[PDB]
Design a protein around this ligand. Structure first.
Ligand SMILES: Nc1ncnc2c1ncn2[C@@H]1O[C@H](COP(=O)(O)OP(=O)(O)OP(O)(O)=S)[C@@H](O)[C@H]1O
Ligand SMILES: Nc1ncnc2c1ncn2[C@@H]1O[C@H](COP(=O)(O)OP(=O)(O)OP(O)(O)=S)[C@@H](O)[C@H]1O
Ligand SMILES: Nc1ncnc2c1ncn2[C@@H]1O[C@H](COP(=O)(O)OP(=O)(O)OP(O)(O)=S)[C@@H](O)[C@H]1O
Ligand SMILES: [Mg+2]
Ligand SMILES: [Mg+2]
Ligand SMILES: [Mg+2]
Lengths: 728, 249
C-alpha cells in the first residue's frame, strides 16, 4: 500500500547529502546512479539530494545522512516520503549565511577554505533553508542558505556564484544543533549500539502503540565497561537520536548534596521524567550513588540506595520512562539493582578492536586536516590498550604537536586567528607518531575480545589438525542441520598437547580467525596472578565475557604453569589441581551446549595435567601437535619468511633437511638470527637489503634444538597414552 | 615576515644579563661575540644586554635570564624585539638604590661586598630602571638604578663611580619579585618540567587562540613523587613563570 513510504536509518557514506537505496528500490522508482532526488519529510519541509546505488544493504531501507535528517526534522527509524525529479536545475545566485554558534573565533574569507573545495567537482543540490555542514580548519561549521532563486532549482555548478558576508544568522530552536553527538559519533560499538537501538527505539518512538499492545518494555538498561569507552557518549547519542526527553543524573553530583537533598533530587528527576512524555533517565556513574549496601558506611547512602530501588520499582509501563545507567565498576553495584524490574538489560561497552579504534580515529580526525602520509590504519594497529578516550587524547595531542610546529614557524600571535592559515596547518604522520610515543593506554590490563589476525597461512604444515579443528568448530556453527539430523551433540572442548613451540597458540588463534569468531586468551600465569588476590569471581567473569561474545573460542594457554603450581598430579604429594582449575571445571560443566562458546586448552606438560580436564564433556578432543617433519619445516620457514626480503639463492628445503628435531619456535629463532646478522651487515656497511644464503648458514651454525630426544620419546608416549591418564 | 621577532625561553648561563642566540641568528643580525645589544619588550620598556655566541641550542630561540625578563615584563615563550647597537657607551654617574624587601637586616656599606666583585672585569651595560640582582652574604639582593646619564649610555667601566646611600626604594606592584620561585629554582627535573610546560604554557599563554581552535586542553595535571621532591615548588614556579592567576588549595 502506497509504495512511496521509505524507512530511514543511519547512512554509510561519510559525506554530505547522498542517500543510499536497496536493490528493489532504484528499479521500483526507476532512478539511475547519479540522479537528483527530492525528499519529502514531516512538518511540510523538503530536501533535495543525490541517490547512491547500493544493493547489499537490506531488503527495504533507505540510508539518510545526519546532515539532512535535521533538514527534514526526521529521526532514526522514521518513515520518509520521496519523489524523483530527474531535471537538471542550475542556480544563479545563492545568498548563503553562517550560524553564530560554530563560526565564533574564526575570521577572514571562510569560503575560500570551506566552500571552495566542497562545491567543485561534486554537483550536489541545494534547497531553501538547508543546513549543510562543511568540515575544515580542525573544526566543523554547519551553514545556511537563506535566499536564492526559487526552491530548489539549484545544484552545484561552476556558473553558481558566491559572496562573502561575515554576518552569521542566529540559530532558532526549531532545528537541532548538528554539533551534538549522534550515532555517527560512536565508533567501535555497532553491535552494542544495535542492541541499544532494538531495546530503546520502539518503546520511545511508538509509545502509544507499545502501550496498547501490552508487552513489557526493557526499562533497566545498564551500560558498563572500562572507563572512557563511550558509555556517556552512547547514552547522550541515544537521547539525541530519539525525540525523548533526556534527564541526566550524575553520581558524584547527587552524592555531593546534603543529606535529604539528594533524595529530593532523585525524586524530582523521576517525577519530571514521568511528566515529560516518553523520556530517558540516565544515571551516569551509578556506582557513586549505589554501592553494595553491605559495604557502605553512612545511613544516608543506604537511604539513597533504597530510594533508588523504590523509584526503580515504582516505575510503571504507563510512564514510558526508560532508565539507563553507566558504570565502570559493574561488580561494585548493589546486586538488588541488577535484578528483574530494576536493571535487567546489561550492555557491555568493551574495549574497541583494531577496526573499531580505526573508526574512532577517523571520527576524531574528520575535522582535522591530515597530510598524505597519515596512515590512520597504521595508528590503529599500533594502539592496543587504547580506548575511545585514549584515541581522542592521542588525536588532540597530535593536533597540538602540529600547532606547536606552526605557532613558532608562523607567528600566530594574532588574537583571533583566521581560517586562511588554519588550513595551512596540517597534521603529519610524524605528529601522530610523537603523540603515540607519549600516550598511556588505560585498558592495557583489560582482557581482549576480538577476532585474531593470524590466518592458516601463518602456520606451516599441521594440515590434519587444521581439518580436525575445522570439523570441530566451523561445522557445528555453520551446519547445525547435519548435527541435529544425525543427533550428535558437538564436543565443546579441545586440548592441545605436544612439545613446546609447535604452534599450539597459533592453531587456536587461526581457528578463531577462520570462523570469524571472537577469541579470548587466558594464560596460566594470568590465572595464577588473578587468583592470588583470592578473587573467585574473575575466573567466573572470564566465562561470562566469553558468553556474551558467542560465537567465541575460550583459549587457556600455558596450562603447564597452572599444573606446576604444586608440581603436578603428584608434585609434593598434594594435588596441583587446585585454585582456579576446579572453578574452570565447574564453569565448563555449567555452560550450555547450545551456546557457541568453544574451549581450547594448550599444554606442553601432558604428564602433570590433571585428569579431570580430560573427562568427556569438558575437554575430550585430545589433539597432539608433534614436531614438524621435513615438509612442515619448509612450510614453517616459508611462513616465517613472508615479511622478509629473502634472496633467491636460499634453499629452504636444505635448511629443513638440516634441521631434524627443531620445532616451529626453533625455526623462527633461526630466521630471526639470520635476519639479525643481515641487520648487523647493513649497519656495518652503512659506516645489501637482502637476507642471503650466507646469513642462514651462519645462523644454522649456532642453531640449537629446544626438544631433547628423550623429550621426543616421552611426548610420543603421551601422544599414544593420554586418554588413559585418568583412573590411576 | 619581520625578521626581528625572537622567541624567549629560559637561559643556560647562570649569571647576570647575557643573552644567548643560535647559529643563524648572529649571522642574520651581524652581531659578534662580545657585542652590546639592546632588547625591546612589551609595555614600552627596554633592556640593554650582551650577546653570547651559541650554536648547539636550537634552530631559532633566544635565551633570556630571569633577571632581565622582569626588566622587559616578558614571560616564558613570549616574543621579544631586539636591536643591535654596537656603540661603546660609558656612564659618568649612576645613582643606584636598593629595595626594602631584600635589604632588611643588613647594614654597612653593601657596595664593597656586592657591587665591587660584580662590576669589575665584566663590562656589562646598565639601563634606566633596571632591576639586577647580586648574590652574596649567603643571600641575594635585587638592586635598582634610579638616576643616571641619559639611558642607557652605560656599560661597566672603571671610570664609573659609586656612592653609598642606605635608603632603599619601595617596590611597586608593576614588577614581579625575583625572590619568588622560577624555572631556575628547580634542579634535577627538566624532562618533567618540559612535559609540564608543553601541557600548560600553550593553553594559558594563548587562551583565545586555543579556545578558537577547538581542541581539548590537558586540565587534569597530577604531580606525584616522594615527599620533598619539589612538587609544590614546581607548581608555584609554573604559576609564577606564566601570567596565570594562581589559587592554592
Ligand atoms: N567509542 C567511542 N567512539 C568515539 N569517541 C569515543 C568513544 N569512546 C570514547 N570516546 C571519546 O572519549 C570521550 C570519553 O568520554 P566517555 O567515554 O563518554 O566517558 P565514559 O565512557 O562514561 O567513561 P567514564 O565516564 O570515565 S567511566 C568521549 O566524550 C568521546 O569524545
Ligand atoms: N607451525 C608453525 N608455523 C609457523 N610458525 C610457528 C609454528 N609453530 C611455531 N611457530 C613459531 O613459534 C612461535 C610460538 O608458537 P606457539 O603457537 O606459541 O607454539 P606453542 O605450542 O604455544 O609453544 P610456545 O610455549 O608458545 S613457544 C610462533 O609465534 C611462531 O613464530
Ligand atoms: N628539585 C628541586 N630543586 C630545588 N629545590 C628543591 C627541589 N625539590 C625540593 N627542593 C627544596 O626543598 C623544599 C621542599 O618543598 P617541596 O619539595 O616543594 O615540598 P613537596 O615537594 O610538595 O613535598 P611534600 O609536600 O613533603 S609531599 C622546596 O621548597 C625547595 O626549597
Ligand atoms: Mg562518563
Ligand atoms: Mg604459545
Ligand atoms: Mg608540598
Amino acid at each position: 500500500n502506497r509504495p512511496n513510504r521509505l524507512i530511514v536509518d543511519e547512512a554509510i557514506n561519510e559525506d554530505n547529502s547522498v542517500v543510499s537505496l536497496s536493490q528493489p528500490k532504484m528499479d521500483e522508482l526507476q532512478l539511475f546512479r547519479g540522479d537528483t532526488v527530492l525528499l519529502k519529510g514531516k512538518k511540510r519541509r523538503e530536501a533535495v539530494c543525490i541517490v547512491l546505488s547500493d544493493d547489499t544493504c537490506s531488503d527495504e531501507k533507505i540510508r539518510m545522512n545526519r546532515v539532512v535528517r535535521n533538514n527534514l526534522r526526521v529521526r532514526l527509524g522514521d518513515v520518509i516520503s520521496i519523489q524523483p525529479c530527474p531535471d537538471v536545475k542550475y542556480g544563479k545566485r545563492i545568498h548563503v549565511l553562517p550560524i553564530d554558534d560554530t563560526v565564533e573565533g574564526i575570521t577572514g574569507n571562510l569560503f575560500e577554505v570551506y566552500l571552495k573545495p566542497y562545491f567543485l567537482e561534486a554537483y550536489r543540490p541545494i534547497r531553501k533553508g538547508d543546513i549543510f555542514l562543511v568540515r575544515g580548519g580542525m573544526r566543523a561549521v554547519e551553514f545556511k542558505v537563506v535566499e536564492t532563486d526559487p526552491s530548489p532549482y539549484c545544484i552545484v555548478a561552476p556558473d553558481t556564484v558566491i559572496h562573502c558576508e561575515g554576518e552569521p544568522i542566529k540559530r532558532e530552536d526549531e532545528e537541532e544543533s548538528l554539533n551534538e553527538v549522534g550515532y555517527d559519533d560512536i565508533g567501535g560499538c555497532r553491535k552494542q549500539l544495535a542492541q541499544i537501538k532494538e531495546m530503546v527505539e520502539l518503546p520511545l518512538r511508538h509509545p502509544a502503540l507499545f502501550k496498547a499492545i501490552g508487552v513489557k518494555p526493557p526499562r533497566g538498561i545498564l551500560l558498563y565497561g572500562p572507563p572512557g569507552t563511550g558509555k556517556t557518549l552512547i547514552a547522550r547519542a541515544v537521547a539525541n537520536e530519539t525525540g525523548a526527553f533526556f534527564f541526566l543524573i550524575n553520581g558524584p553530583e547527587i552524592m555531593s548534596k546534603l543529606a535529604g537533598e539528594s533524595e529530593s533530587n532523585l525524586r524530582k528527576a523521576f517525577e519530571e521524567a514521568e511528566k515529560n512524555a516518553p523520556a530517558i533517565i540516565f544515571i551516569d556513574e551509578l556506582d557513586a550513588i549505589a554501592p553494595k549496601r553491605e559495604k557502605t558506611h553512612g545511613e544516608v547512602e543506604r537511604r539513597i540506595v533504597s530510594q533508588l530501588l523504590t523509584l526503580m520499582d515504582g516505575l510503571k509501563q504507563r510512564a514510558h520512562v526508560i532508565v539507563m545507567a553507566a558504570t565502570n565498576r559493574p561488580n561494585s553495584i548493589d546486586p538488588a539493582l541488577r535484578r528483574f524490574g530494576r536493571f535487567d538489560r546489561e550492555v557491555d561497552i568493551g574495549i574497541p578492536d583494531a577496526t573499531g579504534r580505526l573508526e574512532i580515529l577517523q571520527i576524531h580526525t574528520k575535522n582535522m586536516k591530515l597530510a598524505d602520509d597519515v596512515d590512520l590504519e597504521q595508528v590503529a594497529n599500533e594502539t592496543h590498550g587504547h580506548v575511545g578516550a585514549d584515541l581522542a587524547a592521542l588525536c588532540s595531542e597530535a593536533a597540538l604537536q602540529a600547532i606547536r610546529k606552526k605557532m613558532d614557524l608562523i607567528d600566530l600571535e594574532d588574537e583571533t586567528i583566521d581560517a586562511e592559515v588554519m588550513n595551512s596547518l596540517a597534521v603529519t604522520m610524524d605528529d601522530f607518531r610523537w603523540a603515540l610515543s607519549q600516550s598511556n593506554p588505560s585498558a592495557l590490563r583489560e582482557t581482549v575480545v576480538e577476532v585474531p589476525q593470524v590466518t592458516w597461512e601463518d602456520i606451516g604444515g599441521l594440515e590434519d589438525v587444521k581439518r580436525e579443528l575445522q570439523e570441530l568448530v566451523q561445522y557445528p556453527v555453520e551446519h547445525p542441520d547435519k548435527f541435529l539430523k544425525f543427533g550428535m551433540t558437538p564436543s565443546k572442548g579441545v586440548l592441545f598437547y605436544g612439545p613446546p613451540g609447535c604452534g599450539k597458540t597459533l592453531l587456536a588463534k587461526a581457528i578463531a580467525n577462520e570462523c570469524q569468531a571472537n577469541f579470548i586468551s587466558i594464560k596460566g600465569p594470568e590465572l595464577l596472578t588473578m587468583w592470588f588476590g583470592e578473587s573467585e569471581a574473575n575466573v567466573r567473569e572470564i566465562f561470562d565475557k566469553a558468553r556474551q561474545a558467542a560465537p567465541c573460542v575460550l583459549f587457556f594457554d600455558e596450562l603447564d604453569s597452572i599444573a606446576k603450581a604444586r608440581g603436578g598430579n603428584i608434585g609434593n604429594g598434594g594435588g596441583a589441581a587446585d585454585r582456579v582449575i576446579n572453578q574452570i571445571l565447574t564453569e565448563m560443566d555449567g555452560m550450555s551446549t547450545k551456546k557457541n562458546v568453544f574451549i581450547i586448552g594448550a599444554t606442553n606438560r601432558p604428564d602433570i595435567i590433571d585428569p579431570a580436564i580430560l573427562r568427556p564433556g569438558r575437554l575430550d578432543q585430545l589433539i597432539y601437535i608433534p614436531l614438524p617433519d621435513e615438509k612442515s619445516r619448509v612450510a614453517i620457514l616459508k611462513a616465517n619468511l613472508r615479511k622478509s626480503p629473502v634472496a633467491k639463492d636460499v634453499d629452504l628445503e636444505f635448511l629443513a633437511k638440516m634441521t631434524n628435531g627443531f620445532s616451529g619456535a626453533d625455526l623462527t629463532e633461526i630466521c630471526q638470527r639470520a635476519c639479525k646478522l643481515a641487520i648487523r651487515e647493513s649497519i656495518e656497511s652503512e659506516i645489501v637489503p637482502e637476507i642471503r644464503r650466507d646469513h642462514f648458514e651462519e645462523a644454522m651454525r649456532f642453531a640449537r634444538r629446544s626438544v631433547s630426544d628423550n623429550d621426543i620419546r616421552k611426548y610420543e608416549m603421551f601422544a599414544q597414552t593420554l586418554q588413559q591418564s585418568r583412573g590411576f
